[PDB]
Amino acid sequence: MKVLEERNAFLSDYEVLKFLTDLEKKHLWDQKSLAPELQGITRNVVNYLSINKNFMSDESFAELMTKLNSFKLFKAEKLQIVNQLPANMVHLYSIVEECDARFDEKTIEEMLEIISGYA
Amino acid sequence: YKGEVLGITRFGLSKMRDSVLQLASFEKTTDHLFDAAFYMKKDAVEGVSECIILGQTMSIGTGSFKVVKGTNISEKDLVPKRCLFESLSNEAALKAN
Amino acid sequence: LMISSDAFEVDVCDKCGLMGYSGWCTTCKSAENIIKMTIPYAAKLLFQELLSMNIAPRLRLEDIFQQ
Amino acid sequence: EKAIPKDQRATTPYMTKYERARILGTRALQISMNAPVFVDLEGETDPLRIAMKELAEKKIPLVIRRYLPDGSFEDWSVEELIV
Amino acid sequence: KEVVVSETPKRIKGLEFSALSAADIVAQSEVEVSTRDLFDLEKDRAPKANGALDPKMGVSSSSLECATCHGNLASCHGHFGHLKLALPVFHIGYFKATIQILQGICKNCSAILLSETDKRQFLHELRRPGVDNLRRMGILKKILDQCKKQRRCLHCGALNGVVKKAAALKIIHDTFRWVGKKSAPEKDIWVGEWKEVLAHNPELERYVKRCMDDLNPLKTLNLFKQIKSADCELLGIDATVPSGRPETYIWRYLPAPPVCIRPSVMMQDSPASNEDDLTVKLTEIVWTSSLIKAGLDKGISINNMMEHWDYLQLTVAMYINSGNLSGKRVDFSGRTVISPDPNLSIDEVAVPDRVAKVLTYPEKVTRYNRHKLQELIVNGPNVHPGANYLLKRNEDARRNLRYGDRMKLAKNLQIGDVVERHLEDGDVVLFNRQPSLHRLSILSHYAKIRPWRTFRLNECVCTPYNADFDGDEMNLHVPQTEEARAEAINLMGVKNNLLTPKSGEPIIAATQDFITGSYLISHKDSFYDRATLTQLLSMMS
Amino acid sequence: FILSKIADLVRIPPDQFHRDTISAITHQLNNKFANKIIPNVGLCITIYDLLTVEEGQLKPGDGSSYINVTFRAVVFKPFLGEIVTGWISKCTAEGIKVSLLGIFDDIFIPQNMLFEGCYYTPEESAWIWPKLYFDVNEKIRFRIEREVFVDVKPKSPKERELEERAQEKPPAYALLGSCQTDGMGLVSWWE
Amino acid sequence: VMTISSLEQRTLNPDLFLYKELVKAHLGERAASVIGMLVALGRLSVRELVEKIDGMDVDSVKTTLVSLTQLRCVKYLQETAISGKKTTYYYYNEEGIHILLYSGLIIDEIITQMRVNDEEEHKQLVAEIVQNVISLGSLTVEDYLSSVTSDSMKYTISSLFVQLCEMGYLIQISKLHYTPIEDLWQFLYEKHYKNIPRNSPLSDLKKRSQAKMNAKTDFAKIINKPNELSQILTVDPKTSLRIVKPTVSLTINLDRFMKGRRSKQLINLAKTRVGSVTAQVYKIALRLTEQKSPKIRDPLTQTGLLQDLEEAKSFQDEAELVEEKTPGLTFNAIDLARHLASLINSHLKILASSNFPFLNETKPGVYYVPYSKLMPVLKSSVYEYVIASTLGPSAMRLSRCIRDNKLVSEKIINSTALMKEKDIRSTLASLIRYNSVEIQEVPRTADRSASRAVFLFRCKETHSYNFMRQNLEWNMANLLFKKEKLKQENSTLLKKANRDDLLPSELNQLKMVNERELNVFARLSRLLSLWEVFQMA
Amino acid sequence: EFPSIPLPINGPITNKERSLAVKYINFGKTVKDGPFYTGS
Ligand SMILES: [Mg+2]
Ligand SMILES: [Zn+2]
Ligand SMILES: [Zn+2]
Numbered sequence A: 001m002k003v004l005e006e007r008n009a010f011l012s013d014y015e016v017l018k019f020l021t022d023l024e025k026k027h028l029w030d031q032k033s034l035a036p037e038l039q040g041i042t043r044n045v046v047n048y049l050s051i052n053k054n055f056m057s058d059e060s061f062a063e064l065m066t067k068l069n070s071f072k073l074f075k076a077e078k079l080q081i082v083n084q085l086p087a088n089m090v091h092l093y094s095i096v097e098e099c100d101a102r103f104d105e106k107t108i109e110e111m112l113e114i115i116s117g118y119a
Numbered sequence B: 001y002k003g004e005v006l007g008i009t010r011f012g013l014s015k016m017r018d019s020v021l022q023l024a025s026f027e028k029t030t031d032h033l034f035d036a037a038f039y040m041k042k043d044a045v046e047g048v049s050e051c052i053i054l055g056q057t058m059s060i061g062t063g064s065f066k067v068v069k070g071t072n073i074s075e076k077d078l079v080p081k082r083c084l085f086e087s088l089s090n091e092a093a094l095k096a097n
Numbered sequence C: 001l002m003i004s005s006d007a008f009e010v011d012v013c014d015k016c017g018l019m020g021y022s023g024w025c026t027t028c029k030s031a032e033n034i035i036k037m038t039i040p041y042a043a044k045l046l047f048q049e050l051l052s053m054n055i056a057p058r059l060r061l062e063d064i065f066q067q
Numbered sequence D: 001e002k003a004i005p006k007d008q009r010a011t012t013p014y015m016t017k018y019e020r021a022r023i024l025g026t027r028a029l030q031i032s033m034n035a036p037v038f039v040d041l042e043g044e045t046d047p048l049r050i051a052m053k054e055l056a057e058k059k060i061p062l063v064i065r066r067y068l069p070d071g072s073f074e075d076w077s078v079e080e081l082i083v
Numbered sequence E: 001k002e003v004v005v006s007e008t009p010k011r012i013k014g015l016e017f018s019a020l021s022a023a024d025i026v027a028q029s030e031v032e033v034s035t036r037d038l039f040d041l042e043k044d045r046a047p048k049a050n051g052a053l054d055p056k057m058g059v060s061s062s063s064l065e066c067a068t069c070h071g072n073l074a075s076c077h078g079h080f081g082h083l084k085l086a087l088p089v090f091h092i093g094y095f096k097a098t099i100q101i102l103q104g105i106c107k108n109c110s111a112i113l114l115s116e117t118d119k120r121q122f123l124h125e126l127r128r129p130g131v132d133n134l135r136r137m138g139i140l141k142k143i144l145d146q147c148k149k150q151r152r153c154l155h156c157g158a159l160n161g162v163v164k165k166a167a168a169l170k171i172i173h174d175t176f177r178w179v180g181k182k183s184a185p186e187k188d189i190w191v192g193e194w195k196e197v198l199a200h201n202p203e204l205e206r207y208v209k210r211c212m213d214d215l216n217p218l219k220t221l222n223l224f225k226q227i228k229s230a231d232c233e234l235l236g237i238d239a240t241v242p243s244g245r246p247e248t249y250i251w252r253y254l255p256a257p258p259v260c261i262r263p264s265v266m267m268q269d270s271p272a273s274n275e276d277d278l279t280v281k282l283t284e285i286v287w288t289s290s291l292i293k294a295g296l297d298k299g300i301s302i303n304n305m306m307e308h309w310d311y312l313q314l315t316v317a318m319y320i321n322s323g324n325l326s327g328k329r330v331d332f333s334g335r336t337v338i339s340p341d342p343n344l345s346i347d348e349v350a351v352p353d354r355v356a357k358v359l360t361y362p363e364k365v366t367r368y369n370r371h372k373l374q375e376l377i378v379n380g381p382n383v384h385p386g387a388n389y390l391l392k393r394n395e396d397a398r399r400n401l402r403y404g405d406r407m408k409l410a411k412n413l414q415i416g417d418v419v420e421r422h423l424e425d426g427d428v429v430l431f432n433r434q435p436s437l438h439r440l441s442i443l444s445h446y447a448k449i450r451p452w453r454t455f456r457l458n459e460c461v462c463t464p465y466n467a468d469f470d471g472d473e474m475n476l477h478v479p480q481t482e483e484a485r486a487e488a489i490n491l492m493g494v495k496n497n498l499l500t501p502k503s504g505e506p507i508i509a510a511t512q513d514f515i516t517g518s519y520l521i522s523h524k525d526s527f528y529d530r531a532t533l534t535q536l537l538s539m540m541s
Numbered sequence F: 001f002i003l004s005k006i007a008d009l010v011r012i013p014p015d016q017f018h019r020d021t022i023s024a025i026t027h028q029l030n031n032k033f034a035n036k037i038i039p040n041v042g043l044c045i046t047i048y049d050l051l052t053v054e055e056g057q058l059k060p061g062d063g064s065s066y067i068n069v070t071f072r073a074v075v076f077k078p079f080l081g082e083i084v085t086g087w088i089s090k091c092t093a094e095g096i097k098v099s100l101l102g103i104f105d106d107i108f109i110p111q112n113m114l115f116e117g118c119y120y121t122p123e124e125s126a127w128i129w130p131k132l133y134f135d136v137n138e139k140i141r142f143r144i145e146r147e148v149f150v151d152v153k154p155k156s157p158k159e160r161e162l163e164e165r166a167q168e169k170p171p172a173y174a175l176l177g178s179c180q181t182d183g184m185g186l187v188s189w190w191e
Numbered sequence G: 001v002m003t004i005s006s007l008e009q010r011t012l013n014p015d016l017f018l019y020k021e022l023v024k025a026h027l028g029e030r031a032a033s034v035i036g037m038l039v040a041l042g043r044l045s046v047r048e049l050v051e052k053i054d055g056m057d058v059d060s061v062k063t064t065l066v067s068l069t070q071l072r073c074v075k076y077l078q079e080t081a082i083s084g085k086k087t088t089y090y091y092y093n094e095e096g097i098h099i100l101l102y103s104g105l106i107i108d109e110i111i112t113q114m115r116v117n118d119e120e121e122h123k124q125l126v127a128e129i130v131q132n133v134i135s136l137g138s139l140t141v142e143d144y145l146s147s148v149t150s151d152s153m154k155y156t157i158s159s160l161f162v163q164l165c166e167m168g169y170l171i172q173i174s175k176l177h178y179t180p181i182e183d184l185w186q187f188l189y190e191k192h193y194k195n196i197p198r199n200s201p202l203s204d205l206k207k208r209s210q211a212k213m214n215a216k217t218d219f220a221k222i223i224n225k226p227n228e229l230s231q232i233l234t235v236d237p238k239t240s241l242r243i244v245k246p247t248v249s250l251t252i253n254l255d256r257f258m259k260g261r262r263s264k265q266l267i268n269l270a271k272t273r274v275g276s277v278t279a280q281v282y283k284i285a286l287r288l289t290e291q292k293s294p295k296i297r298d299p300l301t302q303t304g305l306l307q308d309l310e311e312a313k314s315f316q317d318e319a320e321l322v323e324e325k326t327p328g329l330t331f332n333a334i335d336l337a338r339h340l341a342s343l344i345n346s347h348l349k350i351l352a353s354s355n356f357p358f359l360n361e362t363k364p365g366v367y368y369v370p371y372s373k374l375m376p377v378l379k380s381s382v383y384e385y386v387i388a389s390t391l392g393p394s395a396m397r398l399s400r401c402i403r404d405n406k407l408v409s410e411k412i413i414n415s416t417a418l419m420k421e422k423d424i425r426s427t428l429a430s431l432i433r434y435n436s437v438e439i440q441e442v443p444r445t446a447d448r449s450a451s452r453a454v455f456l457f458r459c460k461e462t463h464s465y466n467f468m469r470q471n472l473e474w475n476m477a478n479l480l481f482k483k484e485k486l487k488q489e490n491s492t493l494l495k496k497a498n499r500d501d502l503l504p505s506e507l508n509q510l511k512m513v514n515e516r517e518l519n520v521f522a523r524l525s526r527l528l529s530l531w532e533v534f535q536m537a
Numbered sequence H: 001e002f003p004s005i006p007l008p009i010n011g012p013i014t015n016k017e018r019s020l021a022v023k024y025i026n027f028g029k030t031v032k033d034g035p036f037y038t039g040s
């Protein structure tokens, strides 16, 4: 079919999660009612995307986006680090491009782990 | 109405009708198809005589208009719903760079 | 004149608008421009009678619902 | 292609006998496909008969788009048109 | 996974008439016939093979499927086959077109011979946005009229005479008509060459002297290819499509029609079935074409070659060369004689219960007919308030209500089912007499189920039908949808057509014995009483 | 996960006129944009919202109501793709396959762009890294490099009988990647 | 079905598919669309191109016309009406398409033209100079010399620049050449008619007298404009070197280039006549007489033939008078020929007595090479060597014996060189197929039948020449369309093969398609050398 | 295929015109690289 704007309004993963959460409250629940060919992906996206928060943020999301606004970087990698949560490793370096430096090690460790562990 | 008095005969139906199939409903056939294929008539279907051949609805009488059904929806429901989507990417993209 | 007399389903293509058989164009062998529609059967015999000789009554299509 | 607004409509405000039969047949073809009616009908059959009861009450949710020969849409709702 | 499949309701907006070129015939073709004439009758069931009707084309029987599309005679659209013939032959239908397009060309440079300023003026005159079909033929007549004035050519020194038909299907070019006393250098070459060839043989070729120029169809096939193609716009053809090209009006490939078009007549079930003559004509084309292609290089040619080639030209001319009657055949109709009945209303025709049992009406079940259609199915086809067929919502089949399928079938009755109910009281029906003069010959009525088998109707409505009853038959049609049934009772029925449109006078009103029954009541010598007036008031209502 | 805005026309039958317009159009758009992979856009999931609807037009043939809409269906498509989580499916000495389970299992990653110090054995053991090697059902965070669409290969009708007497194969949405980072490829290689 | 023998483009497009394939491989694809409507229609304005392409706008049509005008692929013509409204009109230019057609033979003949300074300058400098001339179109000197940094050898271009425009190719830019051939005559034909006042009738017109002499006079002056002109040549500054003025821009002339290419076929006919040394002295005597020769047909009879018998008669007679009276090309003396004694004079007498019409009409003793009596022999000597080469020598016998007399008859061919009824008829029908028999009938009945009729065979000229010319253009259109077939099979190979400035299956793919890409050009040059003769009168 | 009637004389690989094809393809590459491309 004729598309109009392909790459428009890059949204995060938690926004998709809360959209499919609020999509299954218009009708009967997916988990509370467990105890037409559309509920499959509806219960499979919400099950697969919640695998990293195992052993939730509206105002904490606001504080986190202001903290990401405190220092500047590239465009979509802020979305990548606000979704992947790189906390207990050096995976932030794995996000932003080569040359492992931009700023020194005792600052990348704390600006990684406080931000990605408070959320 | 064309500026000349020409009646209804073999040479009379060619006054305005561009329709080849309407002019194929008359005697002395097998000569109006070949010059229509030679001079390459575009032949936009508008007359009722070539809408009953193709099975189309005619544009006179009952099919001279269209009826459509109103949705009766307001602009309050057709809103671009939005709550904290592009706020993260707008501030940390033009700061000190 | 059409439904109770000679209702006959067919497929005609958009580019070089001749007709094929239900999945294929027979002229453009890729055959993705196939549009299925109904037509009187005597019009189908008239089209094949014209196409048997050196006349090509090409069908130019447009959608009903535009704006 | 331009749509004439309500304050610039130039056609007749009456209902033609050609547009009385088509709106009734379209309503009766919709009712035969199990559409909800909006009239207190007595128990009967033949959607062409119970569409006349809606036309006499003027509760048909359609409009009659009247095309002029350049594109002059001119909406003309059914309840605006009198019998 | 799968993909989005989108569809749009389309309709026809034009008919661009054109001629098939050499590539378009071969592209839509299935196979070439390739020198087969005996239809390949081997002694198994006398089947058919290549070079004729075959499974590469369509089918003409119950068995022996197509195997291009696996279907019977009811489900095969037919397929074409190309037929290439050596020595490309002249087209019989484009004779006048070839003469008119050869009058507008030089025969040496193969270009147009109109002056390039008058070409510019007439070309600007062609592209006016308002041009009628009667106007453009006049402009092309002016093209061919001014083009018969330039005797020489604007690019070469050759002279153009006149070109016409040799009074056959032979195009002659009478040269040297405009040449008078002023002898051309080409005229000097003409005189020297003919004097030389008469000096060789002064016995035979002296009597025949007016034999100037001929146009071989093999030669003008090679002369239509040397066009500049900016000149294929004043000749009528619009050369913006690759299906333009005046070369494409000469036979180089003959499209063989499908065998679904070629009739296999049903004067059979007898052994050794016979076909029509069109396949015989195709066979007789293929045989002489292969004979020319074989004997082109194998011996005695020239007289047999030109005789068989002109015979092939006459064969192709006979192949496509050799009424305003009724035509269309309509389902759900009847024809019965008529009878008098003034107890019936003017908007009704009484239909007997013997033809109101096979003339059905398709009714979709909904919320407002489930209480009736169940009993209608239970009554069955023999009891008159009943039904015959039943179409499921998921389209299982068209199951008839005759072989099994009792009481339990009416019990389920899913909401998308379509029954075919018998004709009942109050159904819209249209009613016709076959010599239809004006628009009051086809009215619309309501039905009424009665005894003995005639189409009786009231006599206040027999005046537009021109009924003089005496055993005259009339036709009866029932509409089969919800939208055409409304367009008969609203603007076509009896109560909405009390007038004639010829003068506005009432054409459909009181009749013969209803006039003399009103002259005797309203006569002045009649005086009634309550033992009589009450009976008169009770017999009218 | 992008927000693609496309526009088409849909039909609503007369037996669904009792509901409101928004839920009817939303139900008719979900039968078309289920697990119904779009040509060169990716795979749609749901419908976010709809806007600038028009008057419901109708032809004399059907009797249903045709509405041309403009909506913002959510399509699972990374713009280039850098790092995404998905566990392994089955061991093969080729471009190894993973599963982003719940949506589709079609992502390959070619082995030739990974570390050149590995070897696959036919004794059911997987690729051995220059410590222990990986096994089944473990979360793998990998790279996205190449994503090339092939939409529709139509099939000729006389060819459709040589594939039905004896007995889809190209995926319409396939991804590739190239693992390069030291330690990336398994979760418990870190910590 | 399996259409593989090139049938879906076989007959649908001659005479414009060549022009669409010469511009598709050079100027993108959007230029092919606007050049396929100038040929298929003719004259159409800017808005007509927009409403006829169906897919480009005014911002797209007007942009592509500049890229065609820069390669002089579009003629300009402005017009007006009786009420005004002056607008712009565009014609298709075949000279620019011929420049795009040859394109390497321009930079092949110009290499083998200069003297003793050989293989130290004419591989790097002039091979970039002329290639930038042909590619970029109209070039000036100052905008081009600024590309090189620290031009220490800035005078080395000027020595090759003043020499090359002195004797040929480089010429002043198209201030005349964008105008059409027809309107340059028609505007000159009407200005010498309305500026004559009223007078006596004298056979009712009389002005067609004056308007058929004097306009031709200054038409020749217009023909005198693209030649060797001293307005740009031999400018003498004080205390410096002889230099031309580098101010105005300059392009190439496709009029002296073609008459130098005609000398190749003349050398081939000389090698057909005589072997080694006498052909070499005819070669050098023709190369010394190149830049002043009469050319391939002038625009006086390219268009505007007004049906006059005397004009068509004494146009080839006054061309003989142009041939007789040159400012020095008739001076073809012995020491002038040997400068760049009696032995080569004897070889030149052998040229005089060779009796096929080259190097004739020597009444006082000074020799001259005729051209107008040479062109039919040039066009026919190559036509007789193609049927003899491809179709057969018996076909050449059966075709040339038609030409021995005028209209040999059927009972006279079988009396010459071969018996009857065996292969004379098959060969004769095959030559009917290639437009070289032109059958004619005389009847013995009342409706001109085939049984009671006998035939007459005369080889009519300018029907065998035009058909073979169209066939050669067709096969040229073939040979460049198959070159675009390997581009779709190398779109993912030639695009990636640019970052280097082993996978040995690519060695049988990349270096295997290269000779298949070069042999089509090696055959296209021979297509060019065989086709040129039918467009040089 | 279908054409089997004989072939002309301009088809050996004994050419010695290899420089002309190189000049052809370098002219084509310099025209394709130029500013007046306007492709697709
Ligand atoms: Mg009677
Ligand atoms: Zn097609
Ligand atoms: Zn079939």
Ligand SMILES: [Zn+2]
Pocket: E106, E107, E108, E109, E110, E111, E153, E154, E155, E156, E158
């Ligand atoms: Zn001519």
